[PDB]
Write a protein that binds this ligand. Structure first.
Ligand SMILES: Cc1cc2nc3c(=O)[nH]c(=O)nc-3n(C[C@H](O)[C@H](O)[C@H](O)COP(=O)(O)O)c2cc1C
Ligand SMILES: Cc1cc2nc3c(=O)[nH]c(=O)nc-3n(C[C@H](O)[C@H](O)[C@H](O)COP(=O)(O)O)c2cc1C
Ligand SMILES: O=C(O)c1cc(=O)[nH]c(=O)[nH]1
Ligand SMILES: O=C(O)c1cc(=O)[nH]c(=O)[nH]1
Lengths: 311, 311
């Protein structure tokens, strides 16, 4: 009953891994292909292979997680060859998602041009919100820079493209962003990336828990659900219907999934919870969501999608 | 052992209520004066009395709270008369804090001029981050507007002034803000106000839980501690030492208090937890902090203040 239509493709269910979790190597990706996930996405890549930030750079917290990975990835070519090889073997229904996070506008355009030139027929996600690279601010918090990049990208990119956005906290920002985004033939927006630059402390040791950037890292998990839902909902009511939404943030039970769909998300990505539980999470959460739908007498996501009621 | 020096005043301990919680009427304020709080602050006021947003506008959540009060307050004059009367009866060691949140720059300057002209000898907090008034964005997210207001305020205001700031999530924003703030004779900065425009959902009813703004409201409590600590720490390492810091956000145990002090906060404000527990919380949290200090062999806050270690 979780059949979903997104970017003109049909998926068995709306669940995916969030970029960066369980998708670094071909082995990780194969494990995702073998799981019950409806679709999957690669780790955000750069032109060059990156080792990332020094350890420890990820810590499981009682209410979520904190990380400052620093974009460790095997390089753009590694991921491109893998998705191209995978396209030939039609052993999967639905396109694969490819995430890119260039350190500069130039690097992003270069990767997008290569994707445009290749035979890749999947979906591309442009990450405009990595908050863990020292000296690099989040592009998506600079509205003018974001619009300029997108204008240039759409002068040549014709394949499906979505953007991974950082969370916004003021309604006017949603208004400004929606207006910038609505002028482009974007396939989707994915809200949200981790809440940037939080801090977690070990009181006994009187120190931070991660090595990079003096302990400042992205926050994910239960801590961010209220912000994640707000972002999905705020964009759902402002974006032209042609642009769909992927909801990411604080999803760990079928109920969390239900809340994102009610707000208007079409596909759902699981980060922190997947990192803690492994690919078996997809099996569990699908059962939990179906159970919720059964109790309410819903037979398809279209029955309640985007139908959040106001008081 | 919690004796504190802030804005050249001595306080018995660093604890205060956060503006907006338990400080709406004279009766609330008298209860704060009677508690173990080291100091207290009034509800942010406007020139005219305001009823606020429609109910329900505040909900206790398992991990914090969500609210869209809409600045309900008894008006500037009501609070001014009360603090002035209170100044005459020296039945309290340490100044009282007065919070103002004008709906426009003009309204703020008007209130500040009245405070400047009066005999008020306490501390003023300028709220530049109310996220619950429909149609009014947060002034502190507009750097240019914030600097212009402060330039004008300091051409006449000579009494102690602090600013209540919204949380920031990109290091460059801390850099830009610290540079704007460092040019003024500010007494302090208070980080942080609630995380703006989050959303909480009742899955059974399939609706939002607060009436104003379609359910979007400020988030406080456990959800926001990582962001609160990051904001206190980021400003502590960038502001000139003359400007002290009040840490607000996610404080509910002595340990939470300890973490804020370790980051560099001097005074501490309790919002959500005080709203849930009542003024008795001060008595509890003071004992908890002292216990932590005892176990570590600390006899004063100066022993570990701002001493958070990096890895
Ligand atoms: C270990 C880790 C690495 C991440 N790396 C990426 C990444 O490469 N690209 C990206 O767009 N987001 C990345 N994120 C952020 C997520 O994809 C997701 O937006 C976030 O964690 C919020 O969801 P969650 O609450 O389920 O964790 C990462 C998150 C974590 C926990
Ligand atoms: C019911 C409520 C009303 C609030 N009203 C104000 C207010 O008038 N002025 C202000 O500066 N902050 C206001 N806040 C925000 C806080 O003072 C504090 O910054 C926030 O709640 C974060 O702290 P906490 O995690 O302890 O709640 C309010 C918070 C709540 C819960
Ligand atoms: O690789 C990382 O550090 C990273 C990238 C990103 O976009 N988001 C995140 O939380 N981590
Ligand atoms: O009165 C309110 O709604 C209010 C004001 C403010 O500054 N912060 C908050 O959380 N609530």
């Amino acid at each position: 009953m979780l059949n979903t239509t997104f970017a003109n493709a049909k998926f068995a269910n709306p669940f995916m891994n969030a970029s960066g979790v369980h998708c670094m190597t071909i082995e990780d990706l194969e494990e995702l292909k073998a799981s019950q996930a409806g679709a999957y996405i690669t780790k955000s890549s750069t032109l060059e292979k990156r080792e990332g930030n020094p350890l420890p750079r990820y810590v499981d917290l009682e209410l979520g997680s904190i990380n400052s990975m620093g974009l460790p990835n095997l390089g753009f070519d590694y991921y491109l060859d893998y998705v191209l090889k995978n396209q030939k073997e039609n052993a999967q229904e639905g396109p694969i998602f490819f995430s890119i996070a260039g350190m500069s506008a130039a690097e992003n355009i270069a990767m997008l041009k290569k994707i445009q030139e290749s035979d890749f027929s999947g979906i591309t996600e442009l990450n405009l919100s990595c908050p863990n690279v020292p000296g690099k601010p989040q592009l998506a918090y600079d509205f003018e820079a974001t619009e300029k990049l997108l204008k240039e990208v759409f002068t040549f990119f014709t394949k499906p493209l979505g953007v991974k956005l950082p969370p916004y906290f003021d309604l006017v920002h949603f208004d400004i962003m929606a207006e910038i985004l609505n002028q482009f033939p974007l396939t989707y927006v994915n809200s949200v990336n981790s809440i940037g630059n939080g801090l977690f402390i070990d009181p006994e040791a009187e120190s931070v828990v991660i090595k990079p950037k003096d302990g400042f890292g992205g926050i994910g998990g239960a801590y961010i659900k209220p912000t994640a839902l707000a972002n999905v909902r705020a964009f759902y009511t402002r974006l032209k219907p042609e642009i769909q939404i992927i909801g990411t943030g604080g999803i760990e039970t079928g109920q969390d999934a239900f809340e994102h769909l009610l707000c208007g998300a079409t596909m759902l990505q699981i980060g922190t919870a997947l990192h803690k539980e492994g690919p078996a999470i997809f099996d569990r959460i699908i059962k939990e969501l179906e159970e919720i739908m059964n109790q309410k007498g819903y037979q398809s996501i279209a029955d309640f999608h985007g139908k959040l009621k106001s008081l």
